[PDB]
Every structure is written in C-alpha cells, then in structure tokens.
Design a protein that fits this description.
The complex is a heterodimer of chains A (335) and B (87).
Chain A lengths: L3 E5 L4 E6 L3 E7 L2 E3 L6 E4 L1 H9 L5 E3 L10 H16 L8 E6 L5 H14 L3 E6 H8 L10 E6 L4 E6 L4 E7 L4 H14 L2 E2 L2 H11 L6 H4 L2 E8 L5 E7 H24 L3 H10 L1 E4 L8 H9 L3 E3 L6 H8 L4 H4 L4 E2 L1
Parallel strand pairs in A: 1-7, 7-8, 9-15, 15-16
Antiparallel strand pairs in A: 1-2, 2-3, 4-5, 4-6, 8-17, 9-10, 10-11, 12-13, 13-14
Helix pairs in contact in A: 2-3, 4-11, 5-6, 5-8, 8-10
Chain B lengths: L1 H15 L5 H7 L4 H9 L8 H14 L4 H16 L4
Helix pairs in contact in B: 1-3, 1-5, 4-5
The chains are: A alpha+beta (335), B mainly alpha (87).
C-alpha cells in the first residue's frame, strides 16, 4: 500500500530500505526472551543491548539460523518488528515488502517467508535472490545482455552469481562466510594463548586487524582484546597483530575463492569474456576483509570491484525493484 | 566533463610517456582499446555502468604510474560538473 520497503534479512544485522528515504533500519537480527517464561522481551538493538547488560537472565534467539528461516514464530515476530520500525509509527497502512532470499532455496522454505511477511504486516510481499537485489542496488544493468558477476559474502553464506538478461545463469552457494571467519579468530586465540574470547570480540578483532594479504601495512595493524584465561579462570588481555591472524583467516577464505573459481568454469564463455573485462563485483558485510579483493584477483585473474556500499546494497535493491515492473512481474508473489 | 577531459588527458599523456600502445594497455588491463580511447578523449557518459566505469579508471591508473584516488576524485568532480549543469 502506501510505503514500499525492501528488507535484507541477515544473520548479522537486518537492514530495511524505505523508498523515498533510504536505509531507515540497521539493527542486529536478535530477540531476547526471559530465560524462564519464554517471554519475548526485546527485539533488535534494544536486544543486543540488554543481552550485554543481563546475559544471565536471557536466552538470545537468532531467527535466521543458517540462510533461511528456522524458528518461524520468532521470525514472524522479528519480521513484524522491522516492518514496523521501518513503517514509521505515524504510518498506518500495510506496506509493500520485497525480501531478499538466498539462491538455493526450496519452494517450501519460500512459501514460508512469504507467509511470515504477510502475517508480519505486509499488504503484499515479493522475494528476490540476494545477488539480483545487490546488482540492482548498485546500478549495474541486469536487463542488459552483458555478463555480470556478483559475490555476496554475508555472515551465513557466500553466494556467487552470474547475471545476464534480468536472470541468473550460474551460481554457487556455500556455507562459509564471516561467521566462519569470526570462528577462526576465536579458535586461534584459544589454541595459541590459552584465552577464551567470544562473538562480539572476534567480530571487532576481525574489523580492526583482519586481513588475508601480506604487506608491511597489514602486519603492523594491532589491537587489544579481553577474555578469560581457560587455565586460571581469570581475565586476561591480549594484543593481536594483523600478522598472526592472517594465517587462520586465509584457510577459511580459500573455500570462498574455490567457490568463485568453480563458478567461472561452468560459466558460458561469452559471459566470461564480459566478466574478465568488467570484473567481479564483491559485496556484502562478509566481504570487508583486508586484501580479500587482492587475494581474489591473484587467484582467479579477474579484477575485483568492491561495492561502495557493501552493507546496504541488497536492501536498496529490494526497494529499487518495486519500480522495475519488468523485473517485478518476474518475482514470486503473495498479497 | 571538462574535468573528465582533463582526466583522459592525463591518462593519454601518461601512457605515451612510455612505449605503450592502446592495444598493449588493453592486454594488461583486460579493457578494450575502444573503451580506453573514449576514456582518454574524456567521453564517459554511457561507457558502461557507473560501478564499472569507476573500475576501469582504477585499473588504468594502477597500470600507469597514476594515483588511483586523484583520478577517481576527478571522475567524481566530473559528475557533479554535469550535475550542477542540469538544474
């Protein structure tokens, strides 16, 4: 009805794009329920917060387990939360909603999200694979017959898609992408110093000094983090150097590369020639690893482009799309 | 626009400062001498998608001794130079 919104449901942060406004929502994909009753207490940023104040009286539920929807009732609720913060409050119409889905998804998993959305408050809902949305959000012309290649690394899944004629022709999805990065940092810290760190700290180490390419510059990035010594139960404090960390991260990322390479191979040659000319479009919150662009290049030989807006591209696309009737009329519908 | 022209002018000038032909350039950055020509005469309007235009510029600049940033900066002044020129 009145306002149009695109949602990028992620396993990290959910982003909501409002048409006429922009990204009107960037809050963590989390609900906090009381550890006893199962009383949904807060959703979103309000929940990231009270989970750090009072973690001992709370169960944290993250509705998108892997790529799709696991706890449909919790989803429903999360969904209802974001469409509402996005809607405005002073708005009282059911909005039109285009949600980003992963590529490899069963119609059953598809039917679900359509329903959830419809219950959450949408007057009408569309789906769109995360990469087509990204391509549209950056203004690549997906209607054009020239090959395009997007690599969307999130936190849950890395997706590699060849777009050509408002369609996807080849793709690969794999379950390694950014949480597996954070995870490798935690493990490294555990096994080299005997120290235990956790999600939010892993994530900050990754941001401040994470990298997958050698260089005087990357090796002198340092940071200090705090954890618990697994031997003394006491709080320790380490200083990590970008250079100890690279070893671990490379192992994880090799598999994302392999996924890209594996894609190029089963791509129709005519499009490969366009992709070798234009480059690979590297997008997504998972992608912001120092040297990832450089490493991909070295390892596939095509140049790599970074999105100027790595975190908001899919959402902007999910909303951009409600004008594009020619690409709209092709999306699965409900409402 | 004028700033684009000066863009491609720097590219042309810097390429020729070496035994480098347009066609050699296109082999080292998988560009197309066609696209590079246009870039040099400053004609970018419909060369390709903006995202990709900004990547040729990066790539060319990296191939020559140029500063990628000082080159993209120009490209972007150039855009606001057609912008301001609208309304």
């Amino acid at each position: 009805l009145r306002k149009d919104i695109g949602i990028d449901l992620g396993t990290a942060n959910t982003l909501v794009f409002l048409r006429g406004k922009g990204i009107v929502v960037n809050e963590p994909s989390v609900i906090a329920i009381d550890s006893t009753t199962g009383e949904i207490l807060k959703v979103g940023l309000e929940a990231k917060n009270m989970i750090g104040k009072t973690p001992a009286t709370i169960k944290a539920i993250r509705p998108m387990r892997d790529g799709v929807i696991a706890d449909y009732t919790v989803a429903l609720v999360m969904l209802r939360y974001f469409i509402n913060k996005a809607k405005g409050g002073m708005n009282l119409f059911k909005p039109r909603v285009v949600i980003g889905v992963p590529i490899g998804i069963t119609d059953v998993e598809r039917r679900a999200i359509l329903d959830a959305g419809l219950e959450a408050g949408a007057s009408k809902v569309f789906l769109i694979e995360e990469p087509m949305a990204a391509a549209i959000g950056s203004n690549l012309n997906v209607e054009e017959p020239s090959g395009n290649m997007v690599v969307d690394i999130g936190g849950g899944t890395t997706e590699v898609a060849v777009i050509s004629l408002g369609s996807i022709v080849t793709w690969e999805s794999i379950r390694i992408a950014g949480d597996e990065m954070d995870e490798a940092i935690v493990q490294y810290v555990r096994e080299t110093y005997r120290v235990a760190i956790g999600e939010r700290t892993a994530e900050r180490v990754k941001i401040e000094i994470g990298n997958v390419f050698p260089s005087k510059e990357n090796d002198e990035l340092e940071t200090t983090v705090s954890g618990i010594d697994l031997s003394t139960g006491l709080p320790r404090k380490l200083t990590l150097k970008g250079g100890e960390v690279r070893e671990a991260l490379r192992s994880v990322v090799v598999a994302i590369v392999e996924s890209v390479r594996t894609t190029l191979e089963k791509t129709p040659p005519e499009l490969v020639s366009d992709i070798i000319e234009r480059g690979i479009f590297l997008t997504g919150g998972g992608s912001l690893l120092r040297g990832l662009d450089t490493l991909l290049q070295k390892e596939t030989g095509i140049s790599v482009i970074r999105s100027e807006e790595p975190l908001t591209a899919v959402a902007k696309g999910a909303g951009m799309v409600l004008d594009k009737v020619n690409i709209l009329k092709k999306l699965q519908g409900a409402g | 626009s004028e700033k684009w022209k000066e863009l491609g002018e720097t590219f042309r000038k810097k390429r020729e400062e070496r035994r480098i032909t347009l066609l050699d350039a296109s082999l080292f950055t998988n560009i197309n001498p066609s696209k590079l020509k246009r870039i040099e005469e400053g004609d970018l309007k419909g060369l390709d998608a903006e995202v990709y235009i900004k990547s040729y510029i990066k790539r060319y600049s990296e191939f020559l001794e140029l500063s990628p940033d000082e080159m993209l900066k120009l490209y972007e002044e150039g855009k606001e130079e057609v912008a301001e020129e609208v309304e």
